[PDB]
Scaffold this active site. Structure first.
Site, PDB file in Angstrom:
ATOM      1  CG  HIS A   1    -121.077  51.368  19.274  1.00  0.00           C
ATOM      2  ND1 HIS A   1    -121.041  50.091  19.793  1.00  0.00           N
ATOM      3  CD2 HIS A   1    -122.268  51.893  19.641  1.00  0.00           C
ATOM      4  CE1 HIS A   1    -122.172  49.847  20.432  1.00  0.00           C
ATOM      5  NE2 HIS A   1    -122.933  50.925  20.357  1.00  0.00           N
TER       6      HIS A   1
ATOM      7  CB  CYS B   1    -129.554  52.284  23.491  1.00  0.00           C
ATOM      8  SG  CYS B   1    -129.218  52.802  21.788  1.00  0.00           S
TER       9      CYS B   1
END
Ligand code: SF4
Ligand code: SF4
Ligand code: F3S
Ligand code: F3S
Ligand SMILES: [Mg+2]
Ligand SMILES: [Mg+2]
Lengths: 551, 268, 551, 268
Positions: free
Chosen positions: A67, A545
């Site tokens: 990210h 996830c």
């Protein structure tokens, strides 16, 4: 008729609930529910575009780095920044080393205990187990002596009466098919894996400043100062240290992890025939190697109808074809606005309504590509690479197939790759190829520094007025990730993340088509509805996830 | 011998704090769970799932009542009656308060549990709060950081195990060995600070000489921690400032995730 | 009478010259010569007594720590200081961990290639080599696959035609008696040892501040600040780190080093029958565990006439019997004053006259104990322990002999310990027993800290006027070491080091009696006077350190 | 593929500098000798002895004439025509002058070979001097310390191999990456020094809080090195002042082995 709930689904990241209707011992319908939300998208709102990456990295710590890099790539997209090639080399090394750790931990720590019975390992003959691997692997830690040491540790654990994280697992479950010796083998490798993944993260640490959560990125490049002759910065000694750990990765990956994938396949042949999640596949190209955010080591693309001949390559993170196709819908998710939204216009306003089979039942949005649902991840990235006729991928896949054929005398056709084991195989192939990525980019970095280029950062020019839109793609361990940033008057006016597990764990979409986890489960046989190991097996193959999926 | 029981509950977590355990070397995670503790409950690692994993919790809660250390990872969302984190059909707060009653000690691992962290930043969409606010009648050991060095946690539970009591704590209930000093009051670039030798942009001459990063927005001057000394990953020389990036204040309430990366320590 | 010279003797520390007379294929007479001198004793003279240890540690970096600890013990003796028990725990852990690194490196890196042929290892069947270890050792790194990887490293080394420091070794020499298989085993173990010795030195580093050359001592104690709750000091986290490395040593020492010792003996049984250096043996007691510099874990003493029944125990570093007997003579060394000198009245005035068989021929002084020449070192410390009826030492020796018996059908009597192999066996025994002092002293340190005792230092009161004499004994890897300090008016007026390789490598003394090295060479068979492997073999068994011997 | 030749000569050495290689991790010794370089001569490790090993030296000297890097370990005693260090019946100075003639690069490892070090301290009984004094008119790379971090040496050699030239050197010919800065100008206890927080005696309050060691005789203010940053042994947090004892100045001529441990340094 019979309805079961698995809540929490364990050995994944985050909070996942899976419901199934069971008919005649077979699941007929399924629901995937992400049950925790933080609102990371709203949290980053209204901040300097440069702040975003440090904040949204915290969407997830299992897939740390991902990210972070996507976020700077999005801001860089918005501001038309060409990333210095040195920063590319460093970003790539971090991403490849992290993904090595990530995949290893997924196969062993998160997934192995679906397929491996520890109580059966206790019954094994260590010498027999070691002999089974003769001519199969050249790994130096397959001795009967090694396996005895491992068996004794399990023995001592069970003896203590405190089984801990191994307590009340599916031991003696009829879907457990490994013989004692192979169970012991796998447990030994489970323990050995932990060393290899630590080594991968030491590479990540030396460039990122730590892990979990690297801290060496910037919009504009990286914060590592390259200076071969400088004290306290990235010099030749630090680079040699990095290389020392890179070099420690490939043996376990090739001789253990790659091998175990095949032996699990050998004992679970039907798992090549169930668990298909989709007929459409998407991956972004990855590891740019030039100074214009392109020239990717790994190709991406789009496949439809489970047909590799339909492969439409994607070779630029600026490809409008990729950018224009992506939307998300909360028709069946706990958000107010239900119609498909393009992420730049995306909205994320919570509307929790409780569970409803026909209504909303998840915090995960349902993404779509030109209206179609699509599976992302190592199976997707492998299929694309195969469709691209990437020689390295075919050869690596063939190595795995050969071991399987050695063990079973059977083979594996590309048709069988659309399955729970094919997905697992894709992940292994990815980890294997990434070892050449590590070597390649390390060298590229060393040669570039010796040409005199030590540039790592270009300062971004962020206009105090005006609107700017950027998108950062990244082929993460679990699939294509995209961060979408809108800047307006110097600050972030909108921020949307569309994360790989969002694609895969997404609920029924606007046209009521089920998501990939949901499709994958239909047809799964259940030996015991109160212990649905078989469902958990297919779900884990996707490497869920949920912090990622929901953010 | 019987190994001391540990029960781990994740609330609004990114799983970074669990992952830190995988980088540990003293003990390594395998030695932790096989030799130093009994990890009786942990969803990331547990073989058991769904109904069997909840059996494991209630079994451990009763068997090891009054004996386990309870670790909470993640913030706890209070808005809308707890619905922003639901496991097995119940708010995570509920799971947490039930576990807390039988706990011999209670550790909030990570900045989120310690004080709300990133999930409680900005407008705080879910009404996320820290563990102490949820468990006001109990003394909570805070081990902040996003994530902390795993040994800040491991050595804390080792102290409890070896010496039968928590390590010494500061006013915010943080172990002094790890959080007793500002990063700035034990940082190796302080001479460069004293001399006014400052990096101005990443990649500039000063930066490439390892100068102080105050003017890139280093938050070392207001962040308590051991990042400069213990550092990370046990390879030597690895923390954010050493690799070239300013401290963001991730340990410290009001700093990390509140102040901009490039906002200066003296600017509110 | 043929005359050979070996100069330099390699695979030792420092500069050693060995000459031999050979008649009828057997050495009849020998000379040992240390050929480098620094004058370290003179260099420390006239300084504050507190400074000595940092300077005199530089006598040697192989047995680093050793002169450092003996130096502070000598000052403490002079000033009548009782060392804080925590400081003893710390010194003990450093000494024991250092000595484990030291012994392992001596057996493998310094000594192995006397008894092992690497070109023969090329001919080995890895599968056969692995199989012959079944039930002999439980070590987890004895697989055929490990052995093949090792074999390929050798093959590749050979292929490059750059054998480097392996070039022109005694490969193919008639005294090389290992089969190809156990040659390969030993090379694999040689490489494995490097990892174990690094772990040993990580323990040393965490207490010493680095190694080579620790920097954590003081006359009065240690400079480690004990504080469980302190940041940047010796807390629980650092202690756990130290323990983590202590726990990694034992398996290699027990399962590889101990086992290889008996294997070498099994293939070289006549080396239990030659190499006797002396009939008198001395060792100091070591590892004090009280607050008064006593209560040693390891006993010491004096044995004469190769007769364990004569054993006189020494249980105190203040034993006047021990102190009063020690003298050195330069009658055959390159120093001016030739009569035997007690070290407190010792001089070291250089007087180089070059080589003379009948005159002066070495920079090594010749020590005696009440006029006797004695061997010091692990054989001496083993014999003392046996004669003291220390069960641990008997049990450990017997473990080694049992392996020898399993391989040969024969046993080893205490009489055969007076030999080249017995000396090697004593060192292996020492290394094995030190693993338990590491566990014991770590646990003692932990418990003591628990009792509230964090004292590490006692401030030395050094009177500005007066004369004070101190002697610091230490049982070093190579034998009994002693540092002798005289203080006058606050400064060092005299300093003399009598080092274990001084005892062993010493030349003919005041009555022309040869030293242990010289004596041990008589009777050494020589197959090829141009390649005298057999003398190097016996000489290495003493673990020579010539910077130590000469200083 | 052929590995670059290295010839290592020990003069008045303690072998600590060779021993430092046994602690190294990038590369480890075995990787160093098998993969990185070809160690053509080194007495401590050579299989061959006596005449055989002297033959090996002669062979390598002519075979790799113009290509080997020469490493000299230890001081060189000039008093009494070189007799205080004799190998194979000749003064070491002679061996060193001969080997230096065909060297591609020359490295003095350790303070002894760099400036005389411990062996040349006090009255200097053997007239010991550094490598530069013995080899006037030759460029000598000095890697001082007693012993230095082995990677100060290894990364220097690696730079030569990889980039075909030595690394950047300061005025005393020490590589700037390892010796470019005073230890005191990059030391983590500087904030304590600034504030007046000093340890006054081992075991005291300040000492047990990790305060500055200036007043115990720390020579950080007058010695160049990377001991505070690279530190030692790659386990993290390990250098002499981190463990609690002043820098002694072992890197710096006129400091280590000349000033008393507890003698105060000049501060710039
Ligand atoms: S870098 Fe941060 S902590 Fe270190 S001195 Fe400069 S400002 Fe203070
Ligand atoms: S004096 Fe020594 S300890 Fe104090 S700051 Fe300077 S270097 Fe660090
Ligand atoms: S951002 Fe965090 S990890 Fe340490 S260096 Fe600063 S407190
Ligand atoms: S004594 Fe030497 S090792 Fe470094 S800390 Fe000082 S220069
Ligand atoms: Mg989103
Ligand atoms: Mg002497």
């Amino acid at each position: 008729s019979q309805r079961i709930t698995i809540d929490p689904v364990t050995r994944i990241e985050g909070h996942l609930r899976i419901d199934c209707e069971i008919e005649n011992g077979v699941v007929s319908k399924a629901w995937a529910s992400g049950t925790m939300w933080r609102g990371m998208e709203e949290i980053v709102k209204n901040r300097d575009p440069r702040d975003a990456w440090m904040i949204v990295q915290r969407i997830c710590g299992v897939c740390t780095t991902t990210h972070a890099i996507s976020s700077v790539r999005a801001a860089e997209s918005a501001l038309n920044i060409d990333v210095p090639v040195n920063a590319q080399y460093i970003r790539n090394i971090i991403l490849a080393a992290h993904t090595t750790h990530d995949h290893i931990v997924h196969f062993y720590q998160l997934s192995a205990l679906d397929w491996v019975d520890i109580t059966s390992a206790l019954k094994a003959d260590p010498a027999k187990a070691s002999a089974m691997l003769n001519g199969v692997s050249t790994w130096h830690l397959n001795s009967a002596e090694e396996f005895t040491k491992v068996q004794n540790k399990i023995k001592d654990l069970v003896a203590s009466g405190q089984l801990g994280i191994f307590a009340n697992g599916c031991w003696g479950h009829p879907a457990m098919q490994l013989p004692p010796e192979v169970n012991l083998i796998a447990v030994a490798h489970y323990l050995q894996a932990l060393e290899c993944q630590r080594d991968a993260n030491r590479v990540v640490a030396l460039l990122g400043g730590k892990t979990p959560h690297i801290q060496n990125l910037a919009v504009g490049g990286v914060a590592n100062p390259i200076n071969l002759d400088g004290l306290g910065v990235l010099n030749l000694e630090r680079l040699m240290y990095i290389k020392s750990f890179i070099d420690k990765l490939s043996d376990f990956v090739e001789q253990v992890y790659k091998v175990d994938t095949a032996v699990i396949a050998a004992f679970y042949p039907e798992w090549l025939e169930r668990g298909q999640g989709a007929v459409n596949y998407l991956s972004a190209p990855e590891f740019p190697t030039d100074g214009k955010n392109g020239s990717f080591l790994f190709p991406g693309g789009y496949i439809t109808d489970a047909d590799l001949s339909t492969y439409r390559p994607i070779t630029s993170h600026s490809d409008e074809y990729l950018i224009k196709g992506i939307q998300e819908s909360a028709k069946h998710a706990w958000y107010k606005d239900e119609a498909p939204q393009a992420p730049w216009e995306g909205t994320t306003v919570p509307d929790y309504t409780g569970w409803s089979d026909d209504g909303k039942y998840s915090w995960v949005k349902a993404p779509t590509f030109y209206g179609k649902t699509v599976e992302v991840g190592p199976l997707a990235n492998m299929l694309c690479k195969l469709a691209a006729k990437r020689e390295s991928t075919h050869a690596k896949l063939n190595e795995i197939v050969a071991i399987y054929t050695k063990l079973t005398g059977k083979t594996i056709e590309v048709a069988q790759l659309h399955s729970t084991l094919g997905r697992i195989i894709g992940r292994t192939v990815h980890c294997c190829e990434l070892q050449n990525v590590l070597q390649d980019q390390y060298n590229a970095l060393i040669v570039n520094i010796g040409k005199g280029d030590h540039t790592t950062f270009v300062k971004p020019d962020i206009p105090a007025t005006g609107e700017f839109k950027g998108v950062g793609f990244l082929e993460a361990p679990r699939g294509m990730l995209s961060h979408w940033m809108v800047i307006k008057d110097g600050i972030i006016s909108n921020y949307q993340a569309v994360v790989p597990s969002t694609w895969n764990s997404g609920p029924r979409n606007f046209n009521d088509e089920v998501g990939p986890y949901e499709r994958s489960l239909v047809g799964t046989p259940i030996a015991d509805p109160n212990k649905p190991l078989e469902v958990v097996r297919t779900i884990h193959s996707f490497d869920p996830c949920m912090s990622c999926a929901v953010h | 011998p019987q190994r001391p029981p540990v029960i781990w509950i994740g609330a609004q977590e990114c799983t970074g704090c669990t992952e830190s355990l995988l980088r540990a070397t003293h003990p390594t995670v395998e030695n932790l769970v096989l030799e130093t503790i009994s990890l009786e409950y942990h969803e990331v690692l547990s073989a058991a799932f769904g109904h069997q994993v909840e059996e494991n919790k209630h079994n451990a809660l009763e068997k090891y009542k009054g004996q386990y250390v309870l670790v909470v990872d993640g913030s706890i969302p209070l808005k809308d009656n707890g619905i922003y984190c639901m496991v097995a059909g119940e708010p995570i707060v509920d799971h947490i308060r039930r576990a807390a009653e039988g706990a011999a000690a209670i550790i909030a691992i990570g900045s989120c549990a310690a004080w709300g962290g990133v999930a409680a930043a900005g407008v705080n969409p879910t009404g996320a709060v820290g563990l102490q606010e949820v468990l006001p009648g109990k003394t909570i050991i805070n081990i902040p950081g996003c994530p902390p060095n795993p040994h800040n946690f491991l050595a804390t539970v080792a102290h409890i195990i070896t010496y039968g009591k928590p390590p010494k704590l500061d006013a915010k209930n943080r172990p002094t060995f790890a959080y007793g000093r500002l990063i700035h009051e034990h940082c190796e670039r302080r001479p460069h600070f004293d001399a006014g030798r400052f990096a101005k942009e990443f990649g500039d001459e000063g930066h490439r000489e390892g100068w102080c990063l105050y003017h890139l927005g280093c938050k070392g001057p207001e962040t308590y921690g051991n990042c400069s000394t213990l550092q990370f990953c046990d390879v030597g020389g690895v923390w954010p400032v050493a690799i070239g990036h300013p401290c963001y204040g991730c340990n410290e309430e009001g700093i990390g995730f509140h102040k901009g990366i490039h906002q200066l320590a003296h600017v509110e």
